[PDB]
Structure formats: structure tokens, C-alpha cells
Design a protein around this ligand. Structure first.
Ligand SMILES: CC(C)[C@@H](NC(=O)CC1CC1)C(=O)N1CC[C@](O)(c2ccc(Cl)cc2)C(C)(C)C1
Ligand SMILES: CC(C)[C@@H](NC(=O)CC1CC1)C(=O)N1CC[C@](O)(c2ccc(Cl)cc2)C(C)(C)C1
Lengths: 91, 283, 279, 91
């Protein structure tokens, strides 16, 4: 219950995040992934505030990837708090 | 005169527009472009066309992309002639990124409005899943230039290609007849946003559990709209406007149906939709 | 036409065919605008910027990129404004000159009377005639009616001035393409013209002067003879001298160009290592 | 026979190659560089056949890179033989 990897193949991943305490209001979730070492250009996609699960595809086998979730608030009150949740995975 | 709770609603709706609609499109960035590094051509099955149907829906909505640079330069894309199929989808990955930018702002719009946060999550999800396309199409009409057939989106510009055809063929496509007829009305900023509220809070939408709680809100904004016209527009000539706007939203609901259907046929050939489009669209 | 003259044309024609891609199909991975030097406020001795602007504005073109699928991407360059804007298309043009230069060097290397020459003199001729050879090749794909250089997928069309045509032909480089096009030369003439420009003894750095001047004269006679054999002599009597005069103007355009390039390079280093090694 | 680094700073390099053997053969020399491990997109430039020295600039301090020189023949005879010469440096 962080961020966590529900299930994974060496090419695909299933991610889950607990649906935290501010949905009112977060509008969207920016989800990022890139090979943990820098060089590859970072990939991103968004999902609606009501989603607790997302899919990350096209990964390379036995490679270390970094995943991050950014919560984007609708203009006006947070909850001036955030942090981005992170996890590192080997396929 | 317009009553204080109606005045309060418009004030809110107008603030949501201002806070969540970038008329300059200045934050729409890192979008894909054609010829800048999708589905492989079909050589040549029996059960496809479907391909011919998708082609028949897409050709009527053919646009050219114009990208003005800060420096003053102008990059301009003219799409290919049809050939079949593959050529026909060259601009759809850009449009996916365009819909995704638009959707963020729509969701943000709804989230700002009090009468939306107050509603239960399960019903919030149902309204945005059903009205996102419509809200976005109303917003697109605001930047439409009926004279030039262009959607002026700041640095970006999407101008419809010559039908030849002519305007006879052009308005035969519901989507374009809508923008052209809606533009003619020459609505106020207050009207477009009320129109956006009435489209958002629609009880008829599949998935809506708390039907009464939503239908009462639609009716409120509808009265707020009808009242606004009776206060801020010379009533003799602008008597029939409220019913006209209401009819446009009925057509917008049916365009949405036609669109969901067209999108499923497109997605059947190649998955063009982004994760946000999928969730807002039933995937 | 004599057998040694026939033998020369045959060779020169084979070198064109082997080293000039009229389709530009192998010119790839080139830079594009919106895909370089920082603006000046400061300055006093620039001044240098106004001259570069005055040389560049007359040669303003628009880029058209046709795609395989049938699509057409089209760039309209910025109006002059202040600075920077004026150089938006120069990094692409650097890659364009570099593609062209490879082919020119290849052209020379194919010709027997070029390999036979000593390295120190090979270096001198290519360092002096590369720009000219490339400009002759560019004229072959030039369309005088539309003011476009049709380079296969790429197309570079001159911007309106009005101004021009009065202002247009006041720039030596454009008067050249327009006047050279009018002549309506054969493939044999363009390549002989290319040989005469390549083997020029006058070029700085040439040590074996006699050995080169004799070759220029050979191709010049080979050219003059070709016109006297394959073109109706009454009307086409004055053609050889016209072509020869064009090459004198091409030598002076080259001078004007080397000078314009040094002023451009003084503002920002746009030239590629290959362009540098030739200039 | 071999390509060497004449002098180097942690940002710039001076390379030297001894000149075949050939030419007649060779129009230009395609010179390449990029950090030896894959990820970065390989850089290239050409120089005329008569050049024995070239410059490689904008390098990152202390970083294993790979350099290669390809000889390009004018159409007709090599010298049907080639090989590309290679070296590795870390600034
Ligand atoms: C009004 C109509 C001409 C058109 N606008 C445009 O071309 C220019 C935009 C700025 C207004 C438009 O809004 N649409 C709606 C969206 C669309 O359905 C589509 C987008 C992405 C994908 Cl993956 C699949 C389908 C379309 C087929 C692109 C038609
Ligand atoms: C004929 C003239 C209009 C023009 N052609 C073009 O515009 C496009 C067509 C030929 C392909 C041309 O050949 N030139 C020559 C090249 C040039 O001098 C220049 C190139 C690169 C650099 Cl880094 C600096 C300077 C130029 C200023 C671009 C003018």
C-alpha cells in the first residue's frame, strides 16, 4: 500500500496506489517511468483522479525502471501540500 | 432582474472557466506531430472495410495543421489525399494529445464547481465520463472562426480542408453543422459556460445512481440560462434563443453518441486513445 | 568531334551519373528550423550584423518537405525583426552544403585527370571549386518560372520582395541561376562547365600551374567543339563565349561568397567540419 | 594502421589517424563519437580524404566514450576491402 507493483512480466507492469485523502481535489494523476539510470528520455501519461490502477507497457526484460506518481490539484485548496510517491523495479 | 442565487451560480461557473480554460493553449506542449518520430496497411482482407466506414467518418473531418513559432516562422502541414487507409490516420496521434490536454481542463472545470464536489464520487465519475467530449466541443467552438473554417488555438491552428463537396457536403456532417450553427448564435461567455454546466449535469447519462439530485441541478442552470437571456439580451429578437441553445445541447448529446461509436471503430483498427481517453471513454 | 574529346565527355558524364543524386534521396538526418546565435543588444562594432542581414535577406527561401505518404510540411521563414531570426535556415543549409560537397569530391575523384594530379594540387582545386561545382549542380534542378530548387523530397523556393524582379537580379547569385537557366544547356555542357571550373590554375595554392592550365584548355576546346557539332551553329555561335563568361561570374560569386561566409562565421560558427576544411 | 588521441581536456579531444594505403580511394572520412554504453544517440561528421587530424568537442568530464573512423570510397576501386578503426577514452 504505497505505490506497489500488483503483477509484472519482463515487458509489462500493473501498478496500484491507495486512493489518498484529498481527491477533493486532485484532477488527474501524472504517472512516469524511465530506465532507472538517466539516459533514456522519461515517459509520462495521465489518468483521472478516480483511478487506483494503471498499466505501464513496452518495458525491456531484466532492466531497472523508476516509477513516479504526481497528483495534480484543481486550482484551489490542496487536500500547499504535496509529495510524489516512488518505487524502483527490475523486470 | 436575475436572482441572487442565479447570479451566484454564473459567478462560480465563470470563475471555473477562467481558472481551467487556457484560450491561448500555451501549456499544450510535447504533443506528437505527423512526420515526426501509425497502423499498418491492410493488404487486403474480407471483413475490412470496417476500413471503408472509418474512412467515411474521418474524411469529412479533414483538417490541416499550422504551427506558428515564437520567432515568427510558420510550419504548415497539408495532409495526404486518401489512398487508403494508413494515410487517413496521420493526424490522429496529435489529436489524441489534443483531446488529453482538453480533458484535463474539463475535469479541472467540474472539480472547481461546488455543486460538483458535493456530489458522490460514483456520480462524479459518471458525469465526466459522459460529458467530457461535449464540454471540450463547446470550448473548441469558442476559438472557431466560421469565416475561415479554422480553430485558432494560440500557436496551433486547425483549418478544415476543401470538400468539393462544397458547403453542401460540409454541413451534411453533424459535427461541422454544429460548430457553424452554434457560432451563428454569437453567444456570450456566460451562455457558453451555462451551456457547459447543463451538459455536465445531465441525469440521462449511463452510470448515474442519484438521478434526482442531478436533474434538479440541470433545471437550475437551465432556468439561470433562460433568465440571463431575458435580462441581458433585447427580448423581442432574442425570445427564441433559449430553446435554440437547448436544442443544440440535444444535438451535442447525439453527436457524442455518434462520436463514441466512431471512436470504437477507430480503436478496432489501431489503439490511438491515450490512457486518460480510455478511462473517460470506457477502457 | 575528335576521339580524345569524345573520351573526355564520356568520362565526365560517367562521373556525374556516379556522383550526382538528382533525387537527393540520400540526403537524410538534416537539421530543420524549429526542430542558433544569441541576439545582440549590446553592441557598437556590430554594424557587422547589418551587413550579414544585407547579404542574407536577398537569398531568403522557404522550405517545402513532401512526405512519402503524400503529406506536405511547409516552412515560411520569419520576417527580419531584429536579429537571430535571420539565421533559422542556415543549420539546415550547412547540412545541405555538406551533402553536396561529398558528391563534388566524389566527382573529382572519379575523373582520371584528377587522380593523376599531385595531392597538394588536388587539395587546392577542391578547396577553390567546391562551391562553384555545387552551384552548377543546383542550377540543374532550378525552375526559373517558379523560382524553386526542386531537390526531390525537398524544395527551396525564393521569397517575394517586390522589390524583385528588379531587386531579385540585383543579387549576383540569383542573376546567375536565372541567366544560366535561360541558356538551356545540355547535360554534356553542365558537366564540361563543371570540369573547366574544377581544373582552374588561377586558384590559390596551385603549385603545378602548367599541368592544370593545359587541362582547363582541353575541356574548354572540348566544350567549344561540342557546341559546333551538336547545336545549329548560326544561332548557337555565341554560346561558348556566353558559358565562359558565366564561369568568370561564378569565380567572382565564389569570392563574394567566401567573404559573406567569413562575416557569418564571425557572428556564429555555422559551418560544418567539412565546410571548414574546404573554406 | 591505428587511431590515437594526440591531446585531450575533459571537454575536448584531438584525434590523429595515419593516412592509408589509400587513397585514390576515399572521398571523405566519417568520424563518430558517443558514450560507449549504448543509450546516447551516436554523433557523426565528415572530413575530406586529405585530412589526418580532426576535433571532437562538447564532451562530458571523466566519461567512457567510443570513437570510430569510416573511410568512404569514391564509386570504383577500393584501394572491396575495408575495416573501421576504433579507440576508447575517458575524459
Ligand atoms: C470538430 C472536428 C473537426 C475535430 N477537430 C479538429 O480536427 C481540430 C481541433 C482543434 C479543434 C474534432 O474535434 N474531432 C474530435 C476528435 C476526433 O474524434 C479524434 C481525436 C483523437 C483520436 Cl485518437 C480519435 C478521434 C477527431 C476524429 C480528431 C474529430
Ligand atoms: C542559390 C542560393 C539562394 C542558396 N540556396 C538555397 O537557399 C536553397 C537551394 C540550393 C538548395 C545557396 O545555395 N546559398 C549558398 C549557401 C549559403 O551561402 C550558406 C549556407 C550555409 C551556411 Cl552555414 C552559410 C551560408 C546561403 C546563404 C544558404 C546561400
Amino acid at each position: 500500500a504505497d505505490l506497489e507493483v500488483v503483477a509484472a512480466t519482463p515487458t509489462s507492469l500493473l501498478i496500484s496506489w491507495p486512493p489518498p485523502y484529498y481527491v477533493e481535489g486532485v484532477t488527474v494523476f501524472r504517472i512516469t517511468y524511465g530506465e532507472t539510470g538517466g539516459n533514456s528520455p522519461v515517459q509520462e501519461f495521465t489518468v483521472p483522479y478516480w483511478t487506483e490502477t494503471a498499466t505501464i507497457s513496452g518495458l525491456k526484460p531484466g532492466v531497472d525502471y523508476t516509477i513516479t506518481v504526481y497528483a495534480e490539484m484543481y486550482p484551489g485548496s490542496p487536500w500547499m501540500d504535496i509529495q510524489p510517491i516512488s518505487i524502483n523495479y527490475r523486470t | 432582474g436575475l436572482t441572487e442565487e442565479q447570479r451566484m451560480m454564473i459567478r462560480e461557473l465563470m470563475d471555473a472557466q477562467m481558472k481551467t480554460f487556457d484560450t491561448t493553449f500555451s501549456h499544450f506542449k510535447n504533443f506528437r506531430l505527423p512526420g515526426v518520430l501509425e497502423s499498418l496497411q491492410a493488404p487486403s482482407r474480407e471483413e475490412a472495410a470496417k476500413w471503408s466506414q472509418v474512412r467515411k467518418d474521418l474524411c469529412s473531418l479533414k483538417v490541416s495543421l499550422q504551427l506558428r513559432g515564437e520567432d515568427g516562422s510558420v510550419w504548415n502541414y497539408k495532409p495526404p489525399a486518401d489512398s487508403g487507409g494508413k494515410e487517413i490516420f496521420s493526424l490522429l496521434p496529435h489529436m489524441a494529445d489534443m483531446s488529453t490536454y482538453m480533458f484535463k481542463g474539463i475535469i479541472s472545470f467540474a472539480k472547481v464547481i461546488s455543486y460538483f464536489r458535493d456530489l458522490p464520487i460514483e456520480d462524479q465519475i459518471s458525469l465526466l465520463k459522459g460529458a467530457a467530449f461535449e464540454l471540450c466541443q463547446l470550448r473548441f467552438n469558442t476559438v472557431f472562426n466560421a469565416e475561415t473554417g479554422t480553430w485558432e488555438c494560440g500557436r496551433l491552428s486547425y483549418c478544415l480542408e476543401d470538400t468539393a463537396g462544397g458547403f453542401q457536403q460540409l454541413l451534411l456532417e453533424p459535427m461541422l453543422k454544429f460548430h457553424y450553427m452554434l457560432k451563428k448564435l454569437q453567444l456570450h461567455e456566460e451562455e457558453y459556460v451555462l451551456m457547459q454546466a447543463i451538459s455536465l449535469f445531465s441525469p440521462d447519462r449511463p452510470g448515474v445512481l442519484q438521478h434526482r439530485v442531478v436533474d434538479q441541478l440541470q433545471e437550475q442552470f437551465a432556468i439561470t440560462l433562460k433568465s440571463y437571456i431575458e435580462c441581458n439580451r433585447p427580448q423581442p429578437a432574442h425570445r427564441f434563443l433559449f430553446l435554440k441553445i437547448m436544442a443544440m445541447l440535444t444535438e451535442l448529446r447525439s453527436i457524442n453518441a455518434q462520436h463514441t461509436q466512431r471512436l470504437l471503430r477507430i480503436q478496432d483498427i489501431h489503439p490511438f486513445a491515450t490512457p486518460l481517453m480510455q478511462e473517460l471513454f470506457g477502457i
